[PDB]
């Protein structure tokens, strides 16, 4: 990719995060493309599922107060935006992870603060 | 050349210094002196080094 | 179509002749001559590396500015010589041109596209002569062919051209020719 490509990727993530209500970052490692496509089709009704460079997302994160999650990108990171409500995609990711045993939820962002995996589970239950 | 190297100088440097000093003595007399008077060679090599310039690699 | 000038420094020649020119060439400077309608020809020396870089950057024809003892000249690279082996530069002819003049410019043309299985690509003419303004000289011309079949002779006059350019070459010139693909029988028959 080119420098203009990195700039437009950062930009596109900026408007996507601004127009999304909340975001969650998960680990795609050990997940076959078949079940990834199945999960994307399942969550495509309301949410969206994509991936991006950790450093590119780090640079894009300087706009808002989401800078606290930069330490959480150590390791594979797949970012999902919940355009419709909050809990649907979180519950979908939780059930996918518990079914496949190979997906680990790094964390999520909501209410302006970074919260741990136990709090992710709690809010997904809520 | 033997006498010059005994007195710690090369043949070419000795001859060049001698020519610079303007001494017209010939190799016959230098050889007879080398057989004869190391005092004569001591004086001669001293004159040669005195007449030798500062730097030998100058563009001059 | 607008271009920007290329800046380079040059010095006037001290000695003239084959010996001096070849000595300068061994040093790494190319001799050049500057002549024009001003009735004042000049002979100068250029930097081979910078000149080759500019030639590569802006093609065969570029508009150049010459720095002669601080003086600014506007010139065009019109004729030149290249060594058959060392592929170096030995002489270039620079013609003084002011803004707002009509000049004769030879420009290279490129052909691109997708050909049908029975199409053979042929390019007989690769350089055409175009009259245009000094600052409006194009660097390359492109032509496109898609789905050509049978006789699809591409005429030089049929090529689309930008504004402000005149086709000096007669319309009878052909640039691209499309004919039927060859066969093994014809290939083995030719040359015997």
């Amino acid at each position: 990719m080119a420098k203009a490509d990195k700039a437009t990727a950062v930009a596109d993530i900026a408007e996507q995060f601004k127009a999304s209500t909340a975001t969650v970052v998960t680990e795609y490692r050990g997940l076959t493309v078949a079940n990834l496509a199945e999960l994307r089709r399942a969550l495509g009704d309301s949410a969206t599922y994509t991936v991006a460079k950790n450093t590119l997302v780090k640079r894009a994160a300087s706009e808002a107060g989401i800078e606290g999650l930069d330490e959480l990108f150590a390791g594979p990171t797949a970012i999902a935006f919940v355009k419709g409500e909050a809990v649907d995609a979180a519950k979908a990711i939780k059930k996918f992870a518990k079914d496949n045993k190979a997906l680990v939820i790094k964390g999520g962002y909501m209410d302006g603060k970074a919260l741990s995996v136990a709090d992710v589970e709690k809010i997904a239950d809520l | 050349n033997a006498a010059a190297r005994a007195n710690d100088i090369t043949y070419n440097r000795l001859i060049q210094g001698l020519k610079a000093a303007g001494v017209e003595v010939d190799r016959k007399n230098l050889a007879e002196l080398a057989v004869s008077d190391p005092a004569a060679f001591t004086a001669l090599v001293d004159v040669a080094r005195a007449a030798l310039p500062e730097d030998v690699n100058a563009p001059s | 179509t607008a271009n920007i000038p290329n800046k380079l420094t040059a010095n006037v020649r001290t000695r003239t002749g084959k010996g001096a020119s070849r000595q300068a060439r061994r040093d790494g400077k190319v001799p050049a001559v500057l002549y024009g309608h001003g009735t004042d020809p000049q002979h100068l020396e250029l930097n081979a590396r910078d000149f080759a870089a500019v030639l590569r950057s802006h093609g065969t024809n570029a508009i150049l500015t010459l720095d002669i003892e601080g003086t600014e000249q506007l010139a065009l690279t019109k004729a030149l010589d290249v060594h058959p082996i060392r592929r170096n530069i030995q002489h270039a002819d620079l013609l003084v041109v002011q803004r707002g003049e009509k000049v004769t410019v030879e420009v290279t043309v490129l052909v691109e596209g997708d050909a049908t299985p029975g199409t053979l690509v042929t390019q007989d003419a690769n350089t055409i002569e175009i009259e245009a303004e000094a600052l409006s000289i194009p660097e390359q011309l492109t032509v496109s062919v898609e789905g050509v079949e049978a006789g699809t002779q591409i005429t030089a006059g049929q090529i689309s051209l930008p504004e402000g350019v005149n086709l000096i070459s007669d319309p009878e010139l052909l640039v691209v020719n499309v004919v039927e693909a060859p066969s093994a029988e014809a290939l083995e028959e030719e040359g015997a």
């Binding site: - | - | 065969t60 058959p84 082996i85 592929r87 050909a115 690509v121 042929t122 290939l187 015997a192």
Partner: protein, 136 residues
């Protein structure tokens, strides 16, 4: 197997092969060409083999230009013959090539197989040569 149809005189002295080629120094029929480096005698059989090599690799597309023609003849007496007693019969026609002269010219879209086929031709010629493009 390029041979002139007829020549006014059928035997010629040893050609001069001195100097740098002036004619045909720049390539302009197509896009790509080959330029030689040394003095040589390039024969019609060598031209035929090189052209066969170029077509044998380029296959369908493109076409070939040849800027030289082997019309200079050379004589040779058969072995077991005392030297002298007249000139020998001409055996192979040659084209004297001067340094920097363009030998073959190609016009094919893609650099990869264009340079590949030009190299294929290079490897069959007796002297060093280089690739040259239409751009100077």
């Amino acid at each position: 197997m390029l041979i002139p149809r007829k020549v006014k005189h059928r035997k010629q002295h040893h050609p001069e092969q001195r100097g740098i080629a002036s004619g045909g120094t720049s390539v302009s029929f197509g896009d790509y060409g080959i330029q030689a480096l040394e003095h040589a005698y390039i024969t019609n059989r060598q031209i035929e083999s090189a052209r066969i090599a170029i077509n044998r690799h380029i296959k369908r597309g493109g076409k070939v230009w040849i800027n030289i023609f082997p019309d200079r003849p050379l004589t040779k007496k058969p072995a077991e013959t005392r030297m002298g007693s007249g000139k020998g019969s001409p055996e192979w026609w040659v084209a004297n090539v001067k340094p920097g002269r363009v030998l073959f010219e190609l016009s094919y879209p893609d650099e990869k197989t264009a340079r590949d086929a030009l190299t294929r031709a290079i490897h069959k010629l007796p002297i060093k040569a280089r690739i040259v493009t239409r751009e100077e």
